[PDB]
């Protein structure tokens, strides 16, 4: 069983200010907006004679 | 008449944080704490005969 969610489209994203002399190395390039969630299942039964 | 004041010794000095990746060129080296105040007078009367 494989379950994969999606990212909600009705959220608001904002940017908070951190004071740094090197904002490039602190902020980086991209931020983590939403986490793709899911699940997994795997079963095996072996009933012998 | 020359009048020269002094700088009060019972004041509090604080530092506020501003935004610049180049704080050196924004803040500089030294700040203007108190202004030395004073005054001046100069008179001449020439009453002729």
Tell me how far apart the alpha carbons of residues A22 and A19 are, in angstroms, rounded to a whole number.
Answer: 9
B22: distance to nearest CA of chain A, Å? Answer: 6
How many beta carbons lie within 10 A of that of residue B23, not counting itself?
13
Would you say how long chain A is, in residues?
A: 49
What is the SS3 string spanning chain B? CEEECCCCCCCCCCCCCCCCCCHHHHHCCCCCCCCCCEEECCCCCCCCC
Check CB contact of A44 with chain B, cutoff 8 Å: no
- The pair of structure tokens assigned to A48 is 């012998």
Method: cryo-EM
Chain A interface mutation, best of B15, B16, B17, B19, highest count of A Cβ atoms under 10 Å: B19
Tell me how far apart the alpha carbons of residues A21 and B20 are, in angstroms, rounded to a whole number.
Answer: 7
Contacts of B37 (CB under 8 A, 6+ apart): B4, B5
Resolution of the PDB structure in angstroms: 3.8
Interchain contact, B22 vs A20, CB within 8 Å:
no
Tell me how far apart the alpha carbons of residues B42 and B44 are, in angstroms, rounded to a whole number.
Answer: 7
């Amino acid at each position: 069983v494989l379950v994969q969610h999606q990212v909600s489209v009705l959220d608001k994203h904002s940017f908070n200010k951190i004071q740094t002399t090197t904002p490039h190395a602190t902020y980086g390039d991209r931020f983590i907006a939403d986490f793709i969630k899911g699940g997994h299942f795997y079963a095996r039964v072996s009933i012998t004679a």
